[PDB]
Design a protein around this ligand. Structure first.
Ligand SMILES: Cc1ncc(C[n+]2csc(CCOP(=O)(O)OP(=O)(O)O)c2C)c(N)n1
Ligand SMILES: Cc1ncc(C[n+]2csc(CCOP(=O)(O)OP(=O)(O)O)c2C)c(N)n1
Ligand SMILES: [Mg+2]
Ligand SMILES: [Mg+2]
Lengths: 801, 801
């Protein structure tokens, strides 16, 4: 930690290149318009919300960047990737409006988007696909997402895919937000990878929402200490130009001492006082300091500003940042929250009008008018001249990539569609499908396999010799190894999954990890990924409650699919066979990176258990993609049931079908459900359409088109709700669902499958139970089966176990 | 960062207090038993799993701690809180067995616990309620958890609730694990809070699973750099005692330079070599360094040890940490991962027994026998004598607290059961309920309100003046303000929620935050909380997709209940009325902290929307707890339906009921469902039991004892699945569910409820559609309703919007 003063002394401060007066004129108009759209929205009294205080404290920081640093998307690259602080959006809208990119009607529709011509509260690409790029409102996600975006840009350059050398990634953060563990939890990575293309801009106004970050301390010093410790280049923008003279005359070094010794809370109090309270309480601390302002008017004292409000001090920091190589830079900008709002945190509106000399007359002020700059005006000319010199306007977004890829056909996955000689798993099938893709000329180098330390666990070691590990094992290595960092890996996956839009360069990521450490551990990023229109593959390996058998409670995943189904644009599958994995992966590739360019990402749970992999039934392709298909029918004269299974449990329901036929003469229709979720969604869509079209013939859910009315039983390696979600659409009178509800524990797969009551014997008992209720068989028949199969009818519900 | 040598010079370390020779015999027997345990498990060929290499590298560190530092639970406090590294559990089980706390059968049942007398793979209190205490296998969670546990202990002392001054929180971490953002993301608060009762002990063997953490770097230096920068006291345990002579006589300072410049990758290669290699490649780098070992034999050079394996160096570090005040201490212990195994890292184990001189011939080595110390033996006596001096054995856990609390009665919440004067929200109801508890002499001071910055948003700012904010706003403040740090707030919540077991001092936490940032953002911690048997309240404020209307996509929560239902021991509720909030909170209090001491925690979603709060219907209490009750029946001669709602949407379902009655002559039964999830679980439990007892009287789902068979419609502020989960148990032919599937966006509550097709008009159309389907009404009526209510039947599915 250094002295509590600017990192760059005036003598080392470059000359400011812009017209300060004209820029203030433009900046004031932007400030006014941002305040007007929020105030107009609030006038509606519809609890719309929207912030002003924050943007007021950081407007000049952004202004300097828009005028002299921010490079817009161009023919060569996607420009600078700016992670705009979420709640300062009204300022971004205000500027875009001034630039003529947004209309007054859209501003008047701030936070009212349902009808089409509105603006989102925050940066939401899904909602404004041609405007916003990075979802930053969920604090903490922006800093880490930006770190890996910067790393990914280096990756593209190192892999020879794209020269991203002219791009800088800017993460605009708040000091309070740095408390989120993901904000500083990964900063050493930027040092390890020498991310000199990443700039953290922390708005240090010393306050969070309900108070100061650390009133009894100095967060700017805490921030400097840890970022410096993490190897980052730290630039503190503490004081404005007015202080330069005071510090130079400060021969006793007492001013610096006073500055150093004052804590955040104190500084914050002076904030609400006056030029005399300051001189008395701040400067008045030491005669050496009090004597410095002795010859100063209380107004000249109160005129001393924080560095984050001085274009000159701001420019110096961003310039130094862009010059620095070898490591990332963090700019700690000292600002005043709710700057120039005084009374705030029509008299107040008149105050800011006067305060920033806004060109609005007394006659119009009540109309809460938006200000614009006429073509031909100095402000209009300058505003656009600065942007054009920087490649245009930002933020802006391109929803689809331009190139045409020559994707592998399903037949290219032919070997995976055949019966397998060796017993393998769906994970081995996944890796195999990856290899098929690695042979496709068009996308082979666009593939981005991602691992979080463990590769051997997922049988990925074989890929290393083929494509290598990115290690700028060299800068040309293709696989991203992020170590024990699921969030960081997800952020690399996200950068890769959105490269098609950001850099107009489609990249296809495949991140495989322990399924339990997916949505459960990085769920907020997964939701943000949906917002960012990520197109990629998330592979939840070692999935299923009873399949990762020895690991126990914090590893056994019987619910990730319940978490994944909450994301609208995530397509989830739980295949049982290798050929299903092939079909599913081929379809995803086609949908996401083929002509369709569907904004959806995939989640496929794969297993670590080997078993016989049969050949794909001819014509099963569509059913596999839709989520279900009849595997086969077993004859039985004494009854008929329908059996459903997915993942590693399907082969157990298949065994139950043979037992049912063999021991009870009960035949059955056996279905492989590759996706209970896609089926549920299809069912919901049909029922929704039916309800909205009362005069039309009811549409039939696909699952109802595939199944019949015979009593049905479903068993899965996930909690019952996974299969129970399609009940409404199952055309059978009876539908019994078996599942792995309850906490996992360590055992053999056999003991776990019996414990969670999802094995063959339970499926059989469940099937017999429905047939008995129908009078097709006697109840003593099921009571005997229960005894026969060594089933404890009275053991505690596994959910409670 | 400092030189790559021990922090404590030999001339500064204290005399080792223990019997080194006796201690190594005991340590060797533990190492043996740990390996035997894992080897016998693998022999079973059941894919059970289990690690050995990690505990081998940290064995000596734990040994010194067990012999001279770890305080077991005692009459005065819970002893030292040790977050044992998850995968080194076999070593903990090995010592426990040697202490006579575990049986051979139990060791023989390592990772086979489904039938009882077995051992969990990792620290899981839910599975081993009297042994383990803190779930640490999900890496990254142990470190944040520990920081907040230490802070909570300080809190108990400062609040005058318990003298926790004699307790130390030890977090045993892996160096690879430090890559998880949660690992270092919150270390600055240990400095902010001067947590000198916290010790992070990182095993620095330089390797994660599949490779070194930073092959071309120095993680120990990286670690030292950021922790030192964060204000922590860093103690490096680099080299064993054999290095002291070499470092002492090296007047040139070249050995340190060599040590400093050598990277992690090279140090690791040396480990796979021999003395000759080291002499040439390491010492041979410089003449001065070559000269230090020139008079040494290759064997003597090969014997040079890493500090973390030297009891004297280890002891010095822990003793010094014990003396450090004002801040937390990190011990960076340098170790060898595949430490004795060497070649490994049933007879090849004779190499391990040889090197550690284990008493067992190669004749009984294939039998993999366990080693025990007979009562009276020098080893047995020393083992127990050391533990007795430290108050006993650990880990150990007490499942229930001993004291009896005088909980508030439901009557105490009587004001909340009456009709409210003004329109309030369920969040205002929650705060009012908290106030009732705050008047209870028994639990008022055991309450732990927790917020993450935002308090005003949740109307919590009023308790700020009565009970204060913890700020060691003073050291007696009751409210924990954790800033913008949901994970941290969650860890404080967990520490509080488990104080009943850890310190035999029940504390009742109430953590309120934006519901979207609950399970979605800290879901892995929530799962671990269940594992840790947390008893507390999670309050998801500003919940419901359409109710936090202006916030949009990353804030509008219509799925947290779908995430919360995946946790076995989390009880979820979505109340609509203030009296329901009261009944639920009181019941939760009684269940968790009353004589029942139920191991469950609560999740209640509350709202920021004000509306009329009616009085509780007489006798509705049990129904509120169970999940559903009939609000009222509206008469109608033209038809009859059932209408269900929860949270903010219930009042719109009631409006629909009036419309149907008044405009269409359709009568109805209106139900408020406080918990669709609890109703679903009850139904699942009933059918499970039923099918398991086929000849017995069938149990009827609670929801089927409330609803009848008229066509039903349900609507809530959550995705359809939240209400559809009870389908199987609804005693009706038609059960139409409306929901908020799809990403959120900004608009008025009205516009959002129409967009998400969940408002009164949609409920009416859904109900009429069901009747038309039964011919009880013309389809034209439904079509005209759709027209009247301005419903766009061809609007895109909200899930896809
Ligand atoms: C994960 C998450 N938690 C909470 C919030 C709610 N929130 C909005 S603004 C705010 C405080 C902002 O403080 P800071 O990050 O210091 O930025 P400032 O507005 O002062 O520039 C909070 C907590 C959020 N957006 N995301
Ligand atoms: C969140 C999480 N991700 C992955 C794993 C799987 N895992 C088990 S051991 C291991 C590596 C451990 O390395 P380190 O933390 O350096 O400890 P060491 O075993 O070397 O002492 C990993 C990634 C886990 N337990 N938790
Ligand atoms: Mg701030
Ligand atoms: Mg390690």
């Amino acid at each position: 930690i250094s002295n509590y003063i600017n990192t760059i002394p005036v003598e080392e401060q470059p000359e400011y290149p812009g017209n300060l007066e004209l820029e203030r004129r433009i900046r004031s108009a932007i400030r006014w318009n941002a305040i007007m759209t929020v105030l107009r929205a609030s006038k509606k009294d519809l609890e719309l919300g929207g912030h002003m205080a924050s943007f007021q404290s950081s407007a000049t920081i952004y202004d300097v960047c828009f005028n002299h640093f921010f490079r817009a998307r161009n023919e060569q690259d996607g420009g600078d990737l700016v992670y705009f602080q979420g709640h300062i959006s009204p300022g971004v809208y205000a500027r875009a409006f001034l630039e003529g990119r947004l209309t007054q009607e859209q501003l008047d529709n701030f936070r009212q988007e349902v009808h089409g011509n509105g603006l989102s509260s925050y940066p939401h690409p899904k909602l404004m696909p041609e405007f916003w790029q990075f979802p930053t409102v969920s604090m903490g996600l922006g800093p880490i997402g930006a770190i890996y975006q910067a790393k990914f840009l280096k990756y593209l350059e190192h892999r020879g895919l794209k020269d991203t050398s002219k791009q800088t990634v800017y993460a605009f953060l708040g000091d309070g937000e740095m408390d989120e563990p993901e904000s500083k939890g990964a900063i050493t990575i930027a040092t390890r990878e020498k991310l000199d293309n990443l700039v953290f801009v922390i708005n240090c106004n010393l306050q969070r929402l309900d108070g100061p970050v650390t009133g009894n301390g100095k967060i700017i010093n805490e921030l400097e200490g840890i970022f410096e410790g993490a190897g980052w280049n730290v630039i503190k923008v503490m004081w404005g130009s007015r202080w330069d003279e005071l510090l130079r005359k400060d021969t006793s070094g007492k001013l610096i001492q006073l500055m150093n010794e004052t804590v955040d809370g104190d500084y914050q109090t002076f904030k609400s006082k006056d030029g005399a309270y300051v001189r008395e309480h701040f400067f008045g601390k030491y005669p050496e300091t009090a004597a410095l302002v002795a010859d100063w008017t209380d107004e000249q004292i109160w005129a001393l500003n924080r560095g984050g409000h001085d274009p000159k001090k701001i420019y110096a920091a961003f310039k130094k940042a862009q010059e620095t190589k070898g490591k990332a830079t963090v700019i700690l900008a000292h600002t005043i929250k709710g700057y120039g709002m005084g009374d705030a945190a029509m008299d107040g509106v008149r105050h800011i009008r006067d305060r920033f000399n806004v060109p609005v007359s007394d006659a119009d002020i009540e109309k809460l008018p938006y200000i614009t700059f006429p073509e031909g005006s100095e402000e209009h000319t300058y505003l656009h001249a600065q942007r054009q010199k920087l490649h245009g306007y930002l933020p802006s977004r391109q929803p689809n990539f331009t190139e045409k890829l020559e994707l592998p056909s399903l037949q290219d996955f032919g070997a995976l569609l055949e019966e397998q000689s060796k017993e393998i798993s769906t994970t081995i099938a996944f890796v195999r499908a990856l290899n098929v893709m690695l042979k496709n000329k068009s996308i082979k180098d666009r593939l981005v396999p991602i691992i979080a330390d463990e590769a051997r666990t997922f049988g990925m070691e074989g890929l290393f010799r083929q494509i290598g590990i990115y290690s700028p094992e060299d800068e040309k290595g293709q696989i991203l190894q992020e170590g024990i960092n699921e969030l960081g890996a997800g952020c690399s996956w996200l950068a890769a999954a959105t490269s098609y839009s950001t850099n107009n360069l489609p990249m296809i990521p495949f991140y495989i990890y322990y399924s339990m450490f997916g949505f459960q551990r990085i769920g907020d990023l997964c939701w943000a990924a949906g917002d960012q229109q990520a197109r990629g593959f998330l592979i939840g390996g070692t999935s299923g409650r009873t399949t990762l058998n020895g690991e126990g409670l914090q590893h056994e995943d019987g619910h990730s699919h319940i978490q994944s189904l909450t994301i609208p644009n995530c397509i989830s599958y739980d295949p049982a066979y290798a050929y299903e994995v092939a079909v599913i992966m081929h379809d995803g590739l086609e949908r996401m990176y083929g002509e369709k360019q569907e904004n959806v990402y995939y989640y496929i749970t794969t297993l670590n258990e080997n078993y016989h992999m049969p050949a794909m039934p001819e014509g099963a392709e569509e059913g596999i993609r839709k989520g279900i298909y009849k595997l086969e029918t077993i004859e039985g004269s004494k009854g008929k049931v329908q059996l459903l299974g997915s993942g590693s449990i399907l082969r157990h329901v298949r065994e139950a079908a043979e037992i049912l036929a063999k021991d009870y003469g009960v035949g059955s229709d056996v279905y492989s459900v590759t996706s209970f979720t896609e089926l549920a969604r299809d069912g919901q869509d049909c029922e929704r359409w039916n309800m909205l079209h009362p005069l039309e013939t009811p549409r039939v859910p696909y699952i109802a088109q595939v199944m019949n009315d015979a009593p049905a039983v479903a068993s899965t390696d996930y909690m019952k709700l996974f299969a129970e979600q399609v009940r409404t659409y199952v055309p059978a009178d009876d539908y019994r669902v078996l599942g792995t509800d309850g906490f996992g524990r360590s055992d053999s797969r056999e003991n776990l499958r019996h414990h969670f009551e999802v094995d063959a014997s339970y499926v059989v008992v469940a099937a017999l139970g429905e047939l008995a209720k129908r009078g097709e068989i006697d109840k003593k028949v099921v009571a005997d089966a229960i005894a026969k199969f060594n089933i404890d009818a009275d053991k505690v519900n596994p959910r409670l176990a």
